[PDB]
Design a protein around this nucleic acid. Sequence first.
RNA 1: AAACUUUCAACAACGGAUCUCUUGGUUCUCGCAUCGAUGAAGAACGCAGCGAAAUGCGAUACGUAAUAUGAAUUGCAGAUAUUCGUGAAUCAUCGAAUCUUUGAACGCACAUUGCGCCCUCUGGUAUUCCGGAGGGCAUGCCUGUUUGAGCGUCGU
RNA 2: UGCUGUAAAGCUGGGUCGAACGGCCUCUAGUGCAGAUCUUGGUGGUAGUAGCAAAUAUUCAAAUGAGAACUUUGAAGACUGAAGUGGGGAAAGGUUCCAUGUCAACAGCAGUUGGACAUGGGUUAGUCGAUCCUAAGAGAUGGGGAAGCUCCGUUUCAACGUGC
RNA 3: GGCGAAAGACUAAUCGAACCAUCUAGUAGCUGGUUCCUGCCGAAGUUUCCCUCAGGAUAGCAGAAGCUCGUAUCAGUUUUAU
RNA 4: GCCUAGACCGAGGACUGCGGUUUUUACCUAGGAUGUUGGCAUAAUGAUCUUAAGUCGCCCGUCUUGAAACACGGACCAAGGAGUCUAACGUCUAUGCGAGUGUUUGGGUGUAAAACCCGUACGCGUAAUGAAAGUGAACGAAGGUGGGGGCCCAUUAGGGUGCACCAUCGACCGAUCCUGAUGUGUUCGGAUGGAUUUGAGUAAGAGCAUAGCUGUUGGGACCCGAAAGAUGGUGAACUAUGCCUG
RNA 5: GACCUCAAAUCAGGUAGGACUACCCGCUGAACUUAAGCAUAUCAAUAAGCGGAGGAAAAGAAACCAACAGGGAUUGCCUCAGUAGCGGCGAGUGAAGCGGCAAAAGCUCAAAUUUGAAAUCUGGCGUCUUUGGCGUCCGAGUUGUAAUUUGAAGAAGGUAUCUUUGGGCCCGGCUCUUGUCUAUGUUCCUUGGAACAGGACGUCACAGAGGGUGAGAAUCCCGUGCGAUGAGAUGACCCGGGUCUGUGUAAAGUUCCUUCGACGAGUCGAGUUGUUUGGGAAUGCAGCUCUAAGUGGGUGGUAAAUUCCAUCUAAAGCUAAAUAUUGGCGAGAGACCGAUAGCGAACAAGUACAGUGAUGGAAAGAUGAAAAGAACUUUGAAAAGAGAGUGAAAAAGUACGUGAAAUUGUUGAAAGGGAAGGGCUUGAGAUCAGACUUGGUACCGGGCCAG
Lengths: 260, 125, 195, 148
Amino acid sequence: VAENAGHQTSAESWGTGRAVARIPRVGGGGTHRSGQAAFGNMCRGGRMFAPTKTWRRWNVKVNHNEKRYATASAIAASAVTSLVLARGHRVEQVKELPLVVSNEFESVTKTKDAVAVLKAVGAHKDVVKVIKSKKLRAGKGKLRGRRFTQRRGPLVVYAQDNGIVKALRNVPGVETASVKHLGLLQLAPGAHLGRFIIWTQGAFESLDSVYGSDSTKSIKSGYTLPSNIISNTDVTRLINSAEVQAVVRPAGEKTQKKSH
Amino acid sequence: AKISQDVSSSRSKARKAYFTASSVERRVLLSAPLSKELRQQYNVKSLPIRQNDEVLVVRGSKKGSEGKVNSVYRLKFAIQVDKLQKEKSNGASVPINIHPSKVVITKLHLDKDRKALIQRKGGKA
Amino acid sequence: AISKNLPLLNNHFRKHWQERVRVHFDQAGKKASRRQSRLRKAAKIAPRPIDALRPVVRAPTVKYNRKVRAGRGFTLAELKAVGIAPKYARTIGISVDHRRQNKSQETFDANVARLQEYKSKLVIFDKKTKASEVASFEQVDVSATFPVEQPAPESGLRAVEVPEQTAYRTLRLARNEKKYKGIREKRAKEKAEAE
Amino acid sequence: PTRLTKTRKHRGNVSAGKGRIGKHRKHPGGRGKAGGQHHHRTNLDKYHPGYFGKVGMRYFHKQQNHFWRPEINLDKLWTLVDSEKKDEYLSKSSASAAPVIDTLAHGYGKVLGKGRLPEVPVIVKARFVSKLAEEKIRAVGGVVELVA
RNA sequence: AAACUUUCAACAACGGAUCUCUUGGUUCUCGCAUCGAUGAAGAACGCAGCGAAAUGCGAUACGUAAUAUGAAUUGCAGAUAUUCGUGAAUCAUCGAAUCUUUGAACGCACAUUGCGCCCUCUGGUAUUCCGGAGGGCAUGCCUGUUUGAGCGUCGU
RNA sequence: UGCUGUAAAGCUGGGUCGAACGGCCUCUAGUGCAGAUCUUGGUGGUAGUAGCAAAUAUUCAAAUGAGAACUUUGAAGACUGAAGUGGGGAAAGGUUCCAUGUCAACAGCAGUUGGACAUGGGUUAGUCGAUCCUAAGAGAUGGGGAAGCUCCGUUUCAACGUGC
RNA sequence: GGCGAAAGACUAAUCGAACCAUCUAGUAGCUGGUUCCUGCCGAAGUUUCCCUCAGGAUAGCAGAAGCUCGUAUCAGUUUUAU
RNA sequence: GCCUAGACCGAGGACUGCGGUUUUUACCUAGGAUGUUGGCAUAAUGAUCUUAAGUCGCCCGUCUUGAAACACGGACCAAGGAGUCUAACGUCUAUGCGAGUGUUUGGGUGUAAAACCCGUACGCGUAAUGAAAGUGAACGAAGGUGGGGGCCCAUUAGGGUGCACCAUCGACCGAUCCUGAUGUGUUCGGAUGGAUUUGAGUAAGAGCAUAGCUGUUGGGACCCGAAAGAUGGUGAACUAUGCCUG
RNA sequence: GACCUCAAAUCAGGUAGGACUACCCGCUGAACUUAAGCAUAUCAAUAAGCGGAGGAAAAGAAACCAACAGGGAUUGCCUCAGUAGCGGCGAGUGAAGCGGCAAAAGCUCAAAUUUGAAAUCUGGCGUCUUUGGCGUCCGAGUUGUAAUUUGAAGAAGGUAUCUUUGGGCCCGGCUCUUGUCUAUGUUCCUUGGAACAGGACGUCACAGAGGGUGAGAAUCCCGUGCGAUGAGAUGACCCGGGUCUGUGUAAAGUUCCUUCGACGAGUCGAGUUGUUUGGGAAUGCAGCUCUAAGUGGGUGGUAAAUUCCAUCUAAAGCUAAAUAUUGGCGAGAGACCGAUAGCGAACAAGUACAGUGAUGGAAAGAUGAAAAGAACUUUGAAAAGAGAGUGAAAAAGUACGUGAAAUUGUUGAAAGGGAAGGGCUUGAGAUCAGACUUGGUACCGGGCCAG
Ligand SMILES: CN[C@@H]1[C@@H](O)[C@@H](O[C@@H]2[C@@H](O)[C@H](O[C@H]3O[C@H]([C@@H](C)O)[C@@H](O)[C@H](O)[C@H]3N)[C@@H](N)C[C@H]2N)OC[C@]1(C)O
Ligand SMILES: CN[C@@H]1[C@@H](O)[C@@H](O[C@@H]2[C@@H](O)[C@H](O[C@H]3O[C@H]([C@@H](C)O)[C@@H](O)[C@H](O)[C@H]3N)[C@@H](N)C[C@H]2N)OC[C@]1(C)O
Ligand SMILES: CN[C@@H]1[C@@H](O)[C@@H](O[C@@H]2[C@@H](O)[C@H](O[C@H]3O[C@H]([C@@H](C)O)[C@@H](O)[C@H](O)[C@H]3N)[C@@H](N)C[C@H]2N)OC[C@]1(C)O
Ligand SMILES: CN[C@@H]1[C@@H](O)[C@@H](O[C@@H]2[C@@H](O)[C@H](O[C@H]3O[C@H]([C@@H](C)O)[C@@H](O)[C@H](O)[C@H]3N)[C@@H](N)C[C@H]2N)OC[C@]1(C)O
Ligand SMILES: CN[C@@H]1[C@@H](O)[C@@H](O[C@@H]2[C@@H](O)[C@H](O[C@H]3O[C@H]([C@@H](C)O)[C@@H](O)[C@H](O)[C@H]3N)[C@@H](N)C[C@H]2N)OC[C@]1(C)O
Ligand SMILES: CN[C@@H]1[C@@H](O)[C@@H](O[C@@H]2[C@@H](O)[C@H](O[C@H]3O[C@H]([C@@H](C)O)[C@@H](O)[C@H](O)[C@H]3N)[C@@H](N)C[C@H]2N)OC[C@]1(C)O
Ligand SMILES: [NH3+]CCC[NH2+]CCCC[NH2+]CCC[NH3+]
């Protein structure tokens, strides 16, 4: 708010003995404003309580290694069909994830051609989902340059941009990104894992150089992919395994019989 | 999506520029599409509406009415067609204001300036 | 106002500090604008480098002797060793410092070597030069092309030579000698002349 | 965020957690370190002994760079050897070819004597050394070389 | 029992909450350097076919010229105003002008529409008296010109 | 109109209405009112109540008008009683002046009347004033102070005529 | 500061020090208020110090988070002995 | 031991149990209610609203030992209305990396305040202690003793190994006191061995960074509230007093 | 008749003042407040007051920092560092050097005999190709105007003979302003007053930002995106080329040798007083007293004498950039506010109005797509009413979107002996609800209340 808002009066308290509250009041006469209360957060036309300041903290630091952890976790989630479906992407007609497309997609220049490629690779139903999702925003956000809302479409990741970026700008919901610069805001929108990702073959091949492997160092200086604290995540099979079942006791009833 | 930093997507700025537009700017703001016949004749898609043009109303309750423009009432952002009237209960009759984007031009009023404008736009006349 | 076990704080906010708050909301904007300024400045004078060649100097302060860094300009003696007049050196992208001196030999040799490398890579144009030759050169980044290099720490293998006196004792004796130097010479002076 | 604070939970309760009797007021007890010798002595003498008074001599225009002398112990000394050649140096060093460790070049001013060295000769270059540190280096057949 | 009072519902009031918007505000960023004696900022008073204000303008007064453009303006009226055109409307653009009485405000004065002086032209039988038109007369300081002052002082 | 929840609350039937809005996972805050002689706005009981009683005093008839205690005319009865309830001015106001029309608001009843409202009209100087003079006093100027805004000096330490 | 045949009178309904704006959201150990529900636990007005006595700090009493263990040795009680 | 009169309740939901009768892998009163009959479904049945009756029920909020108080605020209604943000911190928790850690001052790059990338320094940590000059952490499986979960050998009892943590006796580094060798710029040096002393130390590192609740200090600082104090201006149309002209 | 000093002129030509407020350079200068009192201290070298600028200002090429193996004009950021220090050593306060970065740029006088030539400059007049050139005459100026030099040097004499060359003009580029030009449905059905809604079939897309149009419009309009193509300015102080003069015994640059090498005074410095600073036997500033020197002078964070060492070179001057910016001008934005909010003001808002004055200072947004703003008849003095009419709607009538509550009228139901209201319980009156199931093929079977 303005630094002087609610403070552009010369009001003084009347004191006590005049049968009114001790809040400061506008002096003078001849106008309806005279004698009215001022300055107080409870007063009409006063200043608000604890006025908002610009030196509030707006940006937040995150450790760079932890941010990279999150990026890798988001990329790994994009290959799990259950997370991609629960994310809300219409990926039921794609045989396998990751969806990798030949590098000629990188050289597509016209929007019509790019949409044809999306239809051929079975990705256009998610685009149609974006088209039929457009709605006027609820509330006062529409007064502030945020008039419409729609779903997120697929993310298309390339290694060389020979016209693919411009061919795909106008398509509603579709986002493009270089494999060199992949970020969480595109990879897990709303903090929800499982973005529908279309890789060109070049980008899919560059992934191993970008993030490294057990036989390739990351181009990222001093960086290695994280390790899990568990190696076999299929706990039920570990429990129902010969090694474990050979030391346990017999199991009781699932529910105890009532005895009294 | 827009790219130029000289272009604003602000709603308030756009509305203020629209409602405070001068008469000269309102002339271009009040453009009407040509019919398919005149579009093939002149190779121009839209022109600013003019007084002695002839129009077909294609939207609203007066859709299908044809007439010659009597006045481009630029102050009211509307045109007035010759016999598209509304008769009051007292017998007097008033024109029906129609926005130019809701009609198609059927016949152009031509002079040197309209012809030069048509040639500028890549058209033929 | 003093209470439970807590560090005693020094928060200096008893003046009208809110009238003097600077929030760098323009950090990204100034980055982009400073970048555009560098771009235009380089395009104006291409293919001449933007940066003058700078010398290599030791850093002062026993905390920073081990380090070497870029200095302000080459000394008059260093340029004299290469045969370049001070007023001419400023027109061919070489920084000059009339204030720095050359007491030792090591830094002098390092900067003479830098000047010779730069002058060997230098190509001056004239009226006889055609635009085909000029267009054949790219705008070199002088700071990157002639970087400041730390002399390496001694590594590898070497024979072990053990003096009879320990290094600790050497340090102790040096300290003692310095500490009593003033009074031992005074005892000497007052004794030799009297005897 | 504000939705997690106890201010939200105190809504509807008269005193906002500040009590009816005590009645949270402006500055009961003073501001800052007020009364450290009078009514806050019972706090300062318990949790901050040594607070009041002067000890030692003044030093006008102290320059911290004069006293720069980071310490490295013997048990950490071999981290300064090139990691690619550490295993080779341990097996091959002798009185004729011993590794040289430039402690000053790595950012250290004095070598201290905590811990145990590998039984391998080493040439240690340092500005300063402790008495025990040099004895342990000389006991594994090495030497300390003073630099400046 | 009515009237009266009280409770509820329905409709009608009183009043302007709620909801929905918004040519406004607020904050951040980016770019730029341009007031005035060549009379500024500000003030007073006027100016339209029909206007009180706001907006604009200055007795050339909701404006003149120029350039661009190309058919309106509009609440009503209206041309000796216009349409294949030196041409409707246009603070669209703007480089030429006009710019009352003032204001740092400058002949003096100012709670006055008060009072001089100078030049050129002009009316009244006029170098003087009375009238009109146009053009001038502030202070501090600098450079220069001209006219001077002082036994301050040189020489003849 | 009902339903769910211990509850904060949530859902639904009917009526009104006219342009946006909600559930779920998260983020965020200028986030929940009965009180503060709280703030602003609105509205009651009191209550058709207190009251509309200083300055001697009004009446008959006619006209007008939809309408007359209150307007106009006539006839009376009165009063101010020249130290006026008469005739003018200074200060202050600023069109209140006059004619015509007009009654929503205002004239603490009324209103056909009005200093109200609307439309027009109206203020003529050689001789009456201002303008000029000086009064107590105010105040420029060579100047002397003061960091300076400015202060001081006017019989003013001055080569001071825009002379006759 | 004025002015006072003097009352602390008068200085624009303001006078034992005018009015106006700003410093200024001046400070208050003092008065008033302090906005949804349910669930569990649950006090103190006592010690020491303080220009301390309507206020603080300090200990006590209370909540929360737990952690190391799993019947070890504990008790606002008795008995025997002293 | 037996006979006999009433009331309230019916939780659970295949079997599994303990017993009993034994006539029998059957039956029971024995790990919680079933059988049968009538009426009704245009309805008795239940719930809410209004009202009558019976019984109980002082006005909320607040300060207080004590309020319905003859204590204070509150005529009524709507809308507004009070622990916030920031700098620097304590504890705890989550997360990343870990003897390190922190990209964001800056540079690179960009789909352009985003996202992505880069490194020198620096901060904090990795060493303490003393006013300071200065000195600076292994006798030993990083020690001995008593406990100690878990693990191991056994076989209940027993033996072994025992991290974290606890009690205790030592050892190492700095300060303090004493002793005082070989030697010397003969006044320095300080070997060595002692002392009911002392440190926010060592004795196989634990930290750095981001975020959250709570607590702390400075800020208008939960909201409203003085009597005052200061700086710069405006008034003698009222009134006080002098003067000038009526 | 000169000169010096001092005057005058409506003398020829100029210049200054005043405004604005965010940032900038100085002067002057509080108190509230904190210290739980209070006087030093703090607030604060802050507010208020005064003088002076610009697009930035200021600062700036060491009388510096240092004590190192040395750095090297100024400014800013990060760090140094809540540290050294200051402080009723209390409350509090508090820099600098180094290091990493942003930006980088360097220089000008005075002090010198041109002395074989005042070589310099304002003005008048004439003239031209006019931000000026040429000619000429006065004037200024020797009490010193040009060339030459600025300590990093440099000068005057020799040098190896080596290296370079100035300006006036024309077209370009770049830079700035500005004109013109641009894809694809308004196809069919349904709802509606209106299609911009839904459904069907499509199209463009380097354009699915935003706005308008009778409801949510990529495809109706303007735009958006992508480029294409003209015009006009401006730049000693940006460069790509031409061009005539190149008066090149002229200017300048380098190396070496010799002799030299001027370097700022009531200033430095000292004492004292006041103020200020982190600056502590005194950090800066200012007043007064004293008052220098020439390997001298300053500084080297504890006063003094003696001896060294280090490092600069004051008392004269100019200078872009990185830095600041609640003002001005032009733009783009937001997890901001949404008419008691947000600026005081979304409106004829610093308006109406108040005060002698300084000053103080509101309230107030929305009919409808379109006035289609209700012709006409009738009752009435009129305002109005009743019919009618317009409209999708008058449950939209310029008392106009929706239209809550307090409070009020009418209608209906009910209750009532000095308050009313509440809880519990049941009766009465009203309302609501359900199993004859989504029942099964006259029977089977089920729901509810009861014996
Ligand atoms: C930068 N703002 C501009 C705004 O000024 C305006 O620009 C007009 C532009 O629309 C006109 O151009 C328009 O009108 C012409 C013609 C009918 O005049 C048409 O031929 C043309 O297609 C159409 N774009 C152009 N002739 C002048 C600009 N100032 O229109 C909007 C805009 C393009 O954004
Ligand atoms: C020492 N210098 C003095 C200088 O001070 C001055 O003297 C004045 C003198 O002129 C004044 O006197 C002057 O000024 C006064 C005026 C002030 O009223 C006049 O009345 C008087 O006539 C006149 N002579 C005298 N009153 C004071 C001296 N210091 O003039 C004379 C002088 C010799 O030059
Ligand atoms: C084992 N007992 C020792 C006890 O003997 C003593 O040791 C001293 C030690 O203090 C002396 O050492 C002392 O003096 C020397 C200086 C002289 O060089 C200093 O360097 C050192 O810092 C200082 N502590 C040492 N020189 C002799 C030992 N016996 O130190 C304390 C102790 C640990 O208790
Ligand atoms: C010189 N005499 C010593 C005597 O002083 C003592 O030595 C102490 C020792 O006990 C202290 O040690 C004590 O305190 C340290 C703590 C401070 O870190 C603990 O770690 C340690 O367990 C504890 N015993 C040690 N800090 C200093 C020695 N002089 O030990 C006994 C003795 C040998 O007689
Ligand atoms: C396994 N070896 C251990 C070694 O690790 C170390 O152990 C310490 C132990 O001594 C410390 O304990 C020590 O210091 C603490 C302290 C609080 O003062 C005291 O209890 C006491 O002085 C002393 N026991 C303990 N706090 C941590 C262990 N790691 O101490 C030596 C040792 C006991 O030999
Ligand atoms: C006819 N009287 C005029 C009139 O212009 C009046 O307008 C109000 C108008 O503001 C109201 O309309 C209102 O609409 C919303 C909502 C609360 O209704 C308000 O928030 C908004 O302020 C206002 N525009 C409208 N409902 C009634 C008219 N008399 O406002 C001023 C006035 C003098 O009273
Ligand atoms: N801003 C405060 C202005 C007044 N100055 C007071 C502080 C001066 C410091 N004095 C400290 C003692 C002297 N060394």
